[PDB]
Amino acid sequence: MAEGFVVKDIHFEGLQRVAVGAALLSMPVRTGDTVNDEDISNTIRALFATGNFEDVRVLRDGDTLLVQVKERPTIASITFSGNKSVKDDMLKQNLEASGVRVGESLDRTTIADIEKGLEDFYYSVGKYSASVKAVVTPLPRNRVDLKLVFQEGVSAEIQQINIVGNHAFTTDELISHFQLRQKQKLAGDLETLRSYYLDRGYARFNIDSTQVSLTPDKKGIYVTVNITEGDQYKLSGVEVSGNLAGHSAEIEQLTKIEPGELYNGTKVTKMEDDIKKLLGRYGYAYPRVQSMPEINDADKTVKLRVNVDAGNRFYVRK
């Protein structure tokens, strides 16, 4: 039951990029409230959850609730050095989708993760021995320069690949398509494998896991891909909704199909691209188009749900 004190006011220490107003709105307490250790735990927990801080302290000072913080440094610049097989822009992109980019905060605890995530990104191009080293340099105004040093290592060529879980198609049939029109890279093989099934009605197809064993000289790899085929599915309908910018009728006309035709992953992509192209011809250069299947295992059918948001109509007068 305890009691706790009544907050007469709140003092902050450490705020820099975080507005005091935004710091207060993110806190579960304000002046006038009676705060106890439980509330202080909530406040500390809440401030940390913003992701803005590297450390939060909250303690009573007479009638004042004192909030002391250590904001994450701001990433002023990211430099990739030593890479060549994979270019700067691609590495920049890979980090951006991973919560890391110039102008944002660097969570100093996640560093090892950034290094490992990049070394792994390298698996996408046949290099399983890459090593990445993050060099963080402290700047003024709590800023930081992030430099990543790469030793890409040797590329590995597929020595052998096995498929486990394929009954509908023979392993040789499937592998026969990994030889383009060593040959193709693993990443390409998986992409080809998936499409093979998705283009033939296997709406449930899934690559469950991929085991890759690197040879002692690290120049070859042995692959085992474990898949779940599932059954073939009939497409029973295509539903499109969202913000169609007054073109539902034309887009609706692009969802035309043969009721009950086989599900086909590629036709779906084509449909979407066709919708994008249609909206482009009206001033919309960046429309959001996503598709989610509604699978009915009962009678092996699929309803395709397409969401569309036309976006910003960009007018440019010369």
Taking CA atoms, 78 is separated from 16, 90, 104, in Å, by 22, 13, 11
Find the length of the chain.
Answer: 318
| Residues 88 to 107 in contact with Mg ion, rule: CB under 5 A | 88
- The residue of the chain with the least Cβ separation from Mg ion equals 80
Q: How far apart are CA 64 and CA 85, in angstroms?
A: 57
- Nearest Cα neighbor of 302 from 264, 272, 275 is 264
CB of 90 to Mg ion, least distance (A): 11
CB of 118 to Mg ion, least distance (A): 12
| Shorter beta-carbon distance to Mg ion: residue 20 or 135 | 135
| Shorter beta-carbon distance to Mg ion: residue 145 or 274 | 145
State yes or no: residue 80 binds Mg ion (CB under 5 A).
yes
| Shorter beta-carbon distance to Mg ion: residue 43 or 83 | 83
Please identify, among the stretches 6-14, 22-30, 85-93, 164-172, the one whose residues bind Mg ion according to the rule CB under 5 A.
Answer: 85-93
| Shorter beta-carbon distance to Mg ion: residue 134 or 295 | 134
State yes or no: residue 197 binds Mg ion (CB under 5 A).
no
Please identify, among the stretches 2-10, 54-62, 82-90, 220-228, the one whose residues bind Mg ion according to the rule CB under 5 A.
Answer: 82-90
Q: DSSP string spanning the chain? A: ----EE--EEEEES-SSS-HHHHHHTSS--TT-EE-HHHHHHHHHHHHTTS-EEEEEEEEETTEEEEEEEEPPEEEEEEEES--SS-HHHHHHHHHTTT--TTSBP-TTSHHHHHHHHHHHGGGGTBSS-EEEEEEEEETTTEEEEEEEEE---B-EEEEEEEES--SS-HHHHHTTSS----S-HHHHHHHHHHHHHTTT-TT-EEEEEEEEE-TTSSEEEEEEEEE-----EEEEEEEEEE-TT-HHHHHHHT---TTEEP-HHHHHHHHHHHHHHHHTTTBSS-EEEEEEEEETTTTEEEEEEEEE---B-----
CB of 84 to Mg ion, least distance (A): 7
State yes or no: residue 150 binds Mg ion (CB under 5 A).
no
| Shorter beta-carbon distance to Mg ion: residue 9 or 88 | 88
CB of 54 to Mg ion, least distance (A): 28
| Shorter beta-carbon distance to Mg ion: residue 94 or 210 | 94
Total number of residues that touch Mg ion (CB under 5 A)? 3
| Shorter beta-carbon distance to Mg ion: residue 36 or 124 | 124
CB of 150 to Mg ion, least distance (A): 8
| Shorter beta-carbon distance to Mg ion: residue 53 or 80 | 80
Q: Are 121 and 206 in contact (CB under 8 A)?
A: no
Please identify, among the stretches 39-47, 78-86, 102-110, 173-181, the one whose residues bind Mg ion according to the rule CB under 5 A.
Answer: 78-86
Q: Are 66 and 11 in contact (CB under 8 A)?
A: yes
CB of 124 to Mg ion, least distance (A): 17
What track of x and - describes contact with Mg ion for positions 23 through 62 (by CB under 5 A)? Answer: ----------------------------------------
What track of x and - describes contact with Mg ion for positions 229 through 268 (by CB under 5 A)? Answer: ----------------------------------------
CB of 102 to Mg ion, least distance (A): 15
As given in the structure block, the two tokens for residue 180 are: 């383009």
Binding region for Mg ion (CB under 5 A): 80, 83, 88
